[PDB]
């Protein structure tokens, strides 16, 4: 039983916040839970509405109350610096002028190294793809869906082949199809039936995934929220996105998850969208359309 392993060196682009031992830190179990969620959403591209087989694989990989986990997650390394940084869209009020709430957080540019490991190669591959999906399409920590906790893969090593990290919008669109085709290629060995599963309606999955990019800002300093008032025109990229978001352009986990991606040293505001069924939908789409955001995926 060889112990296959892979290491990821993730670096924050935006501050990571604790949920509310409140000291800032990267807990491996939480990241494993996000990996579980993203594995669910990614495997939804294969299983579709078949939540039972998805349950069997998710239990086989991440474990359960009964089944033991086939994969172990650990923070073997870290370089973290605490700093007080503003919350994504929270706002304290004061006389004359409002002020956004600063809070204790892991500073951007801080990094940490996860050691994925498993006795099964395929399980390590699935966990790796889940972590990659969490890194590119999601984030970590409190208020993660509002652009906090954005991450990038500064470095990667693995005992198994993975999977090409995108350098541009087009490759970023390709990576979704690559992740889905690889996870499906792994799942086909484990299951007899084909990926097809009626109409696209599975909740929170890549079966109904959408991805958007918005804006551009060459420097990291002008990306994250900064200004204490939106009235000034000196707003950062996230401040501008927050301003257009507050504006009545709407014509109205979380279905939408905004974040910051870095492509060839050029930051952008990504927007992940997970369309569902029973919950109730075009308003997010018309909002993204009116703001001029580009929909890189689906191509």
Automatic annotation (TrEMBL):
InterPro entries in the cross-refs: Cmr1_C (IPR055061), CRISPR-assoc_prot_TM1795 (IPR007522), RAMP_III_fam (IPR005537)
Task: Specify the domain of life of the species encoding this protein.
Answer: Archaea
Query: Does Lyase appear among the keywords?
Result: no
Return one Gene Ontology term, BP aspect: defense response to virus
Q: Which UniProt key words apply to this protein? A: Antiviral defense
Task: Tell me where in this chain the Cmr1 C-terminal domain is found.
Answer: 206-298
Where does the CRISPR type III-associated protein domain lie? Answer: 9-152
Q: Name one Pfam family in it.
A: Cmr1_C
What NCBIfam families does UniProt report for this protein, alphabetically? cas_TM1795_cmr1
Q: What name is this protein filed under?
A: Type III-B CRISPR module RAMP protein Cmr1
Q: What lineage is this protein's organism placed in?
A: Archaea, Methanobacteriati, Methanobacteriota, Archaeoglobi, Archaeoglobales
